[PDB]
Amino acid sequence: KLKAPLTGLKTEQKVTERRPVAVVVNNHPKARPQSGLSKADIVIEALAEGQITRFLAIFQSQMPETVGPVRSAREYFVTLSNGFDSIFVHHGWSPGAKKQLESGAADYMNGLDFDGSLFWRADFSKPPHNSYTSYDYIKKAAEQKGYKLKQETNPLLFQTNESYNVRVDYGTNNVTNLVEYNYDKKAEFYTRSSDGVITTDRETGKPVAMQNIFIVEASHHIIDQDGRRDIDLESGGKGLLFQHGNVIETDWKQVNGRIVPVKDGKWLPFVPGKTWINIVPDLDAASISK
Question: Could you tell me if 33 and 53 are in contact, meaning their C-beta atoms sit under 8 angstroms apart?
């Protein structure tokens, strides 16, 4: 029947009203492999702690069992979550993020408040990379805060040979953080790996697969005395779009809280399926390959 808003794939009527759930997911080496990333429609990676990146996994067409490890919230993540007015799930936060959310920026769930009940601690890992929750517990937390679980969200724009792969380097002089996306002509999708290991979902033991790689160049600026940096996600800018082994040079503008790829005065559509967005402070961090 109808299609899912964030994937463009057909689904059942009930999902059509399932409110998006955006979870901040730990991407520190010790947090891999994470749980539930294969069920996310959109996953956004961006620099968080030092040279370490962090994810915002947005679920809508598919809800995960357990998801995590959960990590601290950042302003740019609150902003990204809001592009879909999603229930914001996290654990801890930066000063800016705190005031933002305490100012009513979004319906949130802080691991701080449920650590011990709706949020649990994994025993095969140590803090603070052992913090998880589940869609079932997330619902229970919504039932207490009076958060609406059903709402319709405006869908993304989807469409109806060659083969280029891409790598993204976040690391610096001494620290390394390499992400690679390899297209599978046969499978007709991309595979991911970080620091040399293929990105899998601990919950399935299977590699995650997406149909769009969207590299976005956004200004990273320090706005803290400790050095914390923010990411200008409103000024628009340039980026790269990889789909079907193809590569497309593009720009991007923010349209209603969403980062929209636009080229020659028009929105570029996405291929139905999962999408992975990589925010980088320099489009130079990316490198394609045949």
Answer: no
Classify residue 264 as left (phi > 0), alpha (psi -120 to 50) or beta: left
Alpha helix stretches (DSSP H) within the chain:
75-82, 95-102, 111-114, 135-145
Instruction: State the virtual CA torsion across 103, 104, 106, 108 in degrees, nearest 10.
Output: 80
Q: For the stretch 34-54, what's the b/e string if a residue is b when 16 or more beta carbons lie within 10 angstroms of its beta carbon?
A: bbbbbbbbbbbbbbbeeebbb
Distance, in Å, from the CA atom of 122 to the CA atom of 101, rounded to the nearest integer, reads 27
Rg for the chain, CA atoms, rounded = 18
CA angle 247–252–255, rounded 5-degree value: 135
CATH code of the domain in which 285 resides? 3.50.90.10
List the domain range (segments joined by +) for residue 221: 1-290
**DSSP class of 257:** T
What's the rounded Cα separation, in Å, for the pair 175 and 157?
37
Question: Residue 145 in contact with residue 77, Cβ under 8 Å?
Answer: no
Experimental technique:
X-ray
CA distance from start to end of the chain: 38
Resolution to 1 decimal, in Å?
2.1
- Residue closest to 70 by CA, chosen among 16, 113, 99: 113
Q: Which two tokens stand for residue 161?
A: 């040979």
Its sign, for the CA torsion 39, 40, 45, 50, is negative
Structural domain count, the chain: 1
Q: What is the DSSP string of 132-153?
A: EEEHHHHHHHHHHHT---B---
Residues in the chain: 290
Q: Which of 181, 212, 211 shows the shortest CA–CA distance to 194?
A: 181
